[PDB]
Design a protein around this nucleic acid. Sequence first.
DNA 1: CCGGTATGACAGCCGCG
DNA 2: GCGGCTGTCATACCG
Length: 904
Amino acid sequence: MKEFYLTVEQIGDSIFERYIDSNGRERTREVEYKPSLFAHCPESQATKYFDIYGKPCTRKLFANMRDASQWIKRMEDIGLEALGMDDFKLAYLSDTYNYEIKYDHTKIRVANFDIEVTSPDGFPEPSQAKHPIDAITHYDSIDDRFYVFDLLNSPYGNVEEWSIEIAAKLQEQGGDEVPSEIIDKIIYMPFDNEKELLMEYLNFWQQKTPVILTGWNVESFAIPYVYNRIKNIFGESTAKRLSPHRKTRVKVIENMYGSREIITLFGISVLDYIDLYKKFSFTNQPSYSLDYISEFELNVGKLKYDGPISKLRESNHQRYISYNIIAVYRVLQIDAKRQFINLSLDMGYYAKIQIQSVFSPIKTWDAIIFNSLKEQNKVIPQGRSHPVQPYPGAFVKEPIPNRYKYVMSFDLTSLYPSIIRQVNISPETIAGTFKVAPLHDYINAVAERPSDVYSCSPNGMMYYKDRDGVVPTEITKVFNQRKEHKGYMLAAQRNGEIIKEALHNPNLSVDEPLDVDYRFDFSDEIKEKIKKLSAKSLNEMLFRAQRTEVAGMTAQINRKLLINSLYGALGNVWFRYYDLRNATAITTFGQMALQWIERKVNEYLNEVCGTEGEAFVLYGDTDSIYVSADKIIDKVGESKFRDTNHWVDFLDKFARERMEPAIDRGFREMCEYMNNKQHLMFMDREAIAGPPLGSKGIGGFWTGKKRYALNVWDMEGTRYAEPKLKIMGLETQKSSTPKAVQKALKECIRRMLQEGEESLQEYFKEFEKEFRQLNYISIASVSSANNIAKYDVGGFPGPKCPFHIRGILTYNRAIKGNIDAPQVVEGEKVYVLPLREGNPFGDKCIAWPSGTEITDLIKDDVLHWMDYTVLLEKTFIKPLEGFTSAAKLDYEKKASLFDMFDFH
DNA sequence: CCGGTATGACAGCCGCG
DNA sequence: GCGGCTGTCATACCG
């Protein structure tokens, strides 16, 4: 097997590596690595090393890393450039592994653990770690076992041993519903005192030292609590043993608001699943607690207990231990579904970085490019501490707030990556500049042609058409690998079809699955002697065909993620290949591309419909245009179509045959006008919107920029049997909007587009009467709690104090003295409720932590004073007028027509 | 260490017989 | 004060 790294660290003049060797064993080694940095040299001096600009460089080899970094410092103090990879870990990875890394996850120790800490005085702060750790459940991926460490005696109670018999029983049989899947995998270890527990867990830690450390909030709680607990009882030297290299660092992470501290454990890659979820899930959640995310992903019911957390070990220790195990297991079930760990491994090895760096698009691309350039014997440029200034961005069209019956959308393919390739945008390819005219003049093509020899962007940038740019080449590569892994996935899909027919007529003798590649599809030379084989062997040849089929998509997804993350990296000042003018070029071209095609789509549709000057494109956002298909329908009449599906077919056929080539011809003209290297503005039909045929619905409406709703029938050649609502930017798609309200507004939107005015009025009328019977959680708004102390003046709302903050300061007055009550942590989101005049609180709102039921100390009175009428107006009625006034509909039986004009 | 533009809510300011 | 208008802040969205 091929050798691969696990963790990599720099300590002083030696790098510390953990790795799997040629025999599958986990090994560690200190290396006094000899790095190589690069300086500018005269022409006459010959080497094979050149920078990205094609300028000669001399490889300067250092004895140790101290000397290397001391030299960079000296180059700064005078005004010269120090070329090469300054991050010596990365340069080491590339040297030890100068080939395509193929990893085996089975050999990688992935640990996820969760601790329990009984704390009667509120949340147990990890910095102090003053309370005994009374439970640790530690799962090891290699062992496939759960290791349970259970404290039996503490200041907070003497408890009996946890029973694995009871833990298996049904909820109505004695509690604890630990699944059969993991019951055989639990290893239970009770302890007489805390010192024995921590010491045994630290010995356990030495034996099964995690390479990847995961869990929920593990970096902000579990790690720093365990480390500080051991440090305070035993000492720093004992606590530092959590690092296999015996080195730890206390790191202070600071946001734009607030500050906290984490512990770095050199020799361990920490992938907190909360951070892993937040980055890769691509959906904002009202709460980021484990129980809420588990509910979302796994559909698993509420993990319920009796009383508060701080009294659960004392009252039901059996349930206390079981809920610590399930908590670990939930993170395991989520990973089984989303694969965010395998993905972060697959991306990390591909780029040849340390796995924690995949949280940073910067570090990843910095290494992928570094790897390719290293083969070319090319030298990477120096990082320059560029200042921060926001460059211009995407174009968004202002839409007329109206109803729109029929809409066809058209989206461009990977717009920004495509722009980079089309114009050849890269640091070294910057050819020159030209005097620019207003963007409009380029959109309308009246301004003189920018250049006869160079590839151009509307911001005044010129790029060589003959050079192959470092950035564009590298993104073409990833684009090609994505394209190549279709030739592996679909190739297995061709082979997966003739298995059910192969097993339909088999002949058994000897199980002989001959070695033939699944990535490259089978030919008639192999297909002839593969169907007459054994019946039992066909199952294994299908099992490995499915293995390759998923593996093809797994790598394919990682390429798209890499594609989509490039632009953001190029726009980041801390990026090695960052250039202000280049990022401006990517974006301004996009501004042109969208408006250019808008101008072309209108001109084309005017010619075919006979009219002149009418606006067919209603809305355009970044890479997508929206076209009103009203006149196209009216051209053949609505009553001529039999069913809904018959007019969806018509617009689909029209887009395909008539509109696509018009779009295609328009962009080719733009490529020539700009003198670009390659035409890559491919725009294909996205969505087809409209009401049911013979119905009083409106089909779609806009209220403003980034706020619209459509009734979709087809999305890229896929016909929905039942129509889907594509709501974008409206309240129903916002995390702030209450749950019951969220669904009721969506239903109002559904009744608008599909059923008409009369139906909307009927639903709204009744949702008034039974509004008060709905759950109080489903009618509370959600907001992030930031800068609470900034507006806090002795527990009182200060100058310019927000509404959600005003609720937290009413909450603090309500929990006055009670250290048992749940706390509002800054950064964490909170539920918001309004309460009427005459309330026994002070202000007019109250806010409690999100994802939880409000405490019994105030639920007695809050569920009594909360103003529904104000809540009905603020969260439901006001947003509804937003929709209805824009759609030209009325939600209420009789409204005056005059109450729409601004008047005197 | 991946620009654009919406709504809610507050506070300054101007003219308000 | 009572609305209107506008700058600001905070939050959360669209690509």
